[PDB]
């Protein structure tokens, strides 16, 4: 009743081209990493270059799930734009009331899993999943948000 405070989050997945329902109940770690950097990508010729807009834009996703779905998992036992739709909530410190919901959506996510969880002792499962943000050539994609704090 002192300061062991903490919140929760929702993680929703989806497979494109059909209405497949895949989601994650809870994400404890939920380490979100965003990187912008550059080293050198300009020759420097043509007198007036007239343009430069390079910016390395990567979005990293990480969830831990114990709920895959057998509805399809069993059928597949005997890909798609895993596209991800994060869900969470926000609170106002002045009132501390449930009034706002925050959605985060990614329409093109390709999982980049590492096959090296080599460890001696048996853990509490905890199959941490890490994702990479993939983009097409056309336009848009990356992240989309919806605000639900209307009053």
């Amino acid at each position: 009743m002192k300061t062991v405070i903490q919140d929760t989050a929702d993680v929703y997945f989806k497979r494109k081209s059909d209405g497949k329902l895949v989601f994650t109940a809870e994400a404890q770690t939920a380490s979100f990493s965003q990187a912008i950097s550059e080293e050198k990508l300009r020759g420097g010729i043509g007198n007036k270059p007239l343009y430069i807009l390079k910016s390395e834009k990567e979005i990293n996703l990480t969830v831990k799930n114990a709920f895959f779905d057998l509805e399809w998992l069993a059928m597949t036992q005997g890909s798609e734009r895993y596209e991800v739709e994060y869900r969470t909530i926000a609170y106002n410190p002045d009132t501390e009331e449930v009034y706002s919901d925050i959605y985060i959506q990614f329409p093109n996510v390709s999982p980049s899993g590492e096959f090296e969880m080599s460890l001696e002792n048996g853990n509490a499962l905890a199959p941490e999943i890490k994702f990479e943000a993939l983009a097409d050539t056309d336009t848009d994609e990356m992240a989309v948000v919806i605000e639900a704090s209307r009053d």
């Binding site: 009743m1 002192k2 300061t3 919140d7 404890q28 770690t29 380490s31 979100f32 990493s33 926000a90």
Partner: protein
């Protein structure tokens, strides 16, 4: 069948306690294409009379005819037939593994073949296999393999085998040591029979021998009825009156007569598959299972929920803040029922007066242990880190008044001893601990005893760490030497140290403690700190990778984690009245994460927000100088760390 219910319950009881030893039978040995005894009897008849007996052999004839063969031709052709019919290797059967899967105390072998030896050797354990008088004496190991039928490792000779009529006539003297050790093994551990036939009934002779005067202290062994024909109530009545517990294979499930494999496997896998909880059924058995384990849990003062080792034999995982994640659950969810009974009000009234009282005590203890709700329904929770301390803060007059009285209970003496030791008055602490150890023997409360003992070694270790440089460093720092101890006390402590150690402290305590207080194993070694340090270093590198990247982490991925582990360690060895807070770089174990939590927020006071810092967390978590932080400062601070954190 309720009968079968308490039989399996008691098999589960004998499963882990180490009270179980198996009596292997002839059925499994026959189940490996091993030529049965009756075929060798027929071969004997053929070589003797050239004719086979018409009709079933009598009970005596089976071992009787070989006497005729031995006497009329001689042991030449006896050993010849031994060579010819027992030099046949065979492939192993799964029954062997199923039996050994439960790790019995020993194995009693009524088979000539070494198949049991094969199973044991590929299992992983080496048993002191005994077959003769010479074999008992040289037994170095403590786990034994008992071949009452005998083996052939000494060669294919009839002397070493027990298949002669004179032998059962002279078994009482030829092989008596094995017999007496067999009787003891029967006595001191529970017995189950498998694959045993109906020709000689070792059960008959031995049951009669021990029933001879077995008055009231016997646990009747349990026999699985293997033949396809179903058991009769009269037969079961006769045997239970005789002293055996008979369970019919067909009493559970039925199949073909010759399908021994499916019958036996079904029975044994039924018995095995019960892990710890499959027959709880109704709510009345919900309360007692948690009762019998967590009733001792009311003894201790405060427990780290990281220290929740095997509350239910590693059945479930209890994480930091106090939620439950299923770890080894396959049967009844005996924690969800209790927690929802806590959630419900009307269903509480279903508990009787004693039941309701126990429920109230359990709910209070759950409040006092920081466990609130499961991750299934975990929401916005808040746990109280308000530290309860008297010496960690330093109200010295409080203990200086708390010492001047006469105690009533042993707990009072224990806490007084700890308080006085914290004061530096380490001399009379030994005499006090002596008073507890001496008077706390004729009583059933042993956790206090264990902690009392483990104080001694650690305090004396500190004292020995002191005296060496008291006659060393002593004149290096304050010039003048001093002698805070007399010679008699030094002689007594050296004498008690000479023949003492810490490695066998846990092994030195009774079985009941080892079951009820099994968590209390981790703290009384030294590498515990050594073993949580690596967890802290993994957390350190994860946090410092996070800072170097700048990765946002939602919820409880806080070095708080780290620092909440810091409070966990700063509370555990203190609330239990243990000197173990006062050790070597325990201090630096504080120090590393201390300066580290400075650096984390120090770099962290730069956050280059792009789009999500304000929306996700407006009025940011914020680093504030904690009161417990300040107590850490004023309880651990050296100077070099100040220097480097100053230049950093």
């Amino acid at each position: 069948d309720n009968n079968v219910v308490e039989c399996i319950k008691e098999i589960t009881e004998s499963s882990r306690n180490g009270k179980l030893v198996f009596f292997v039978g002839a059925g499994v040995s026959t189940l490996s294409d091993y030529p049965q005894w009756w075929r060798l009897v027929d071969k004997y008849h053929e070589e003797l009379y050239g004719s086979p007996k018409k009709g079933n052999y009598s009970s005596d004839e089976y071992l009787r005819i070989p006497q005729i063969f031995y006497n009329v031709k001689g042991e030449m052709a006896f050993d010849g037939i031994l060579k010819d019919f027992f030099q046949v290797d065979k492939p192993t059967n799964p029954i062997h593994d199923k039996i050994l899967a439960m790790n019995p105390a020993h194995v009693i072998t009524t088979n000539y073949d070494n198949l049991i030896d094969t199973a044991c050797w590929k299992r992983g354990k080496y048993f002191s296999v005994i077959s003769a008088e010479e074999d008992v004496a040289n037994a170095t190991s403590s786990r034994y393999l008992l071949k009452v039928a005998g083996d052939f490792r000494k060669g294919f000779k009839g002397e070493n085998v027990v298949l002669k009529e004179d032998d059962y006539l002279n078994y009482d003297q030829n092989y008596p040591l094995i017999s007496n050790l067999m009787k003891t093994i029967i006595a001191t551990h529970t017995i189950v029979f498998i694959g045993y036939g109906l020709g000689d009934y070792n059960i008959n002779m031995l049951l009669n021998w021990v029933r001879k005067l077995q008055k009231d202290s016997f646990h009747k062994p349990f026999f699985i009825r293997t033949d396809p024909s179903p058991i009769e109530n009269e037969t079961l009545i006769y045997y239970e009156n005789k002293g055996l517990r008979i369970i019919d294979a067909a009493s559970l499930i039925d199949s073909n007569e010759y399908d021994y494999l499916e019958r036996y496997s079904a029975v044994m896998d039924l018995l095995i598959e019960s892990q710890e909880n499959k027959f709880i059924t109704k709510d009345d058995e919900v309360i007692d299972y948690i009762y019998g384990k967590i009733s001792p849990l009311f003894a201790l003062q405060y427990i780290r929920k990281i220290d929740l080792k095997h509350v239910f034999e590693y059945d479930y995982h209890f994480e930091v803040n106090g939620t439950v994640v299923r770890h080894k659950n396959k049967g009844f969810g005996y924690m969800e029922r209790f927690f929802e009974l806590k959630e419900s009000c009307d269903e509480r009234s279903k508990l009787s007066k004693k039941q309701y009282e126990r429920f109230n005590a359990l709910f209070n203890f759950f409040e006092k242990n920081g466990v609130i709700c499961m991750a299934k329904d975990a929401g916005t929770l808040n746990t109280s880190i308000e530290i309860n301390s008297l010496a960690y803060h330093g109200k010295y007059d409080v203990m200086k008044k708390f010492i001047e009285e006469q105690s009533v209970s042993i707990e009072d003496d224990y806490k007084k001893a700890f308080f006085l030791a914290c004061l530096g008055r380490w001399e009379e602490s030994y005499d006090l601990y002596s008073n507890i150890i001496l008077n706390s023997i004729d009583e059933s409360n042993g956790c206090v005893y264990y902690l009392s003992q483990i104080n001694r070694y650690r305090i004396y270790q500190s004292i020995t760490q002191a005296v060496t440089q008291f006659n060393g460093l002593g004149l290096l720092t304050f010039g003048r030497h001093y002698k805070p101890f007399t010679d008699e006390f030094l002689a007594r402590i050296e004498r008690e140290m000479t023949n003492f150690n810490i490695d066998d402290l846990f092994n030195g305590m009774p079985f009941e403690f080892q079951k009820k207080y099994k968590i209390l194993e981790f703290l009384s070694d030294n590498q515990f700190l050594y073993d949580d340090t690596v967890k802290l270093f993994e957390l350190t590198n994860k946090v410092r990778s996070e800072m170097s990247e700048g990765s946002y982490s939602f919820g409880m991925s806080s070095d708080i984690v780290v620092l909440l582990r810091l409070y966990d360690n700063l509370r555990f060895l203190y609330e239990n009245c243990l000197w173990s807070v006062s050790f070597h770089e325990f201090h630096q174990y504080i120090r590393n994460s201390m300066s580290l939590l400075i650096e984390k927020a120090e770099y962290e006071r730069t956050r280059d927000i792009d789009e999500l810092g304000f929306s996700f967390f407006g009025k940011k978590s914020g680093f504030f100088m904690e009161y417990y932080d300040f107590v850490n400062i004023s309880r651990h601070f050296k100077i070099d760390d100040i220097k480097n954190l100053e230049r950093s």
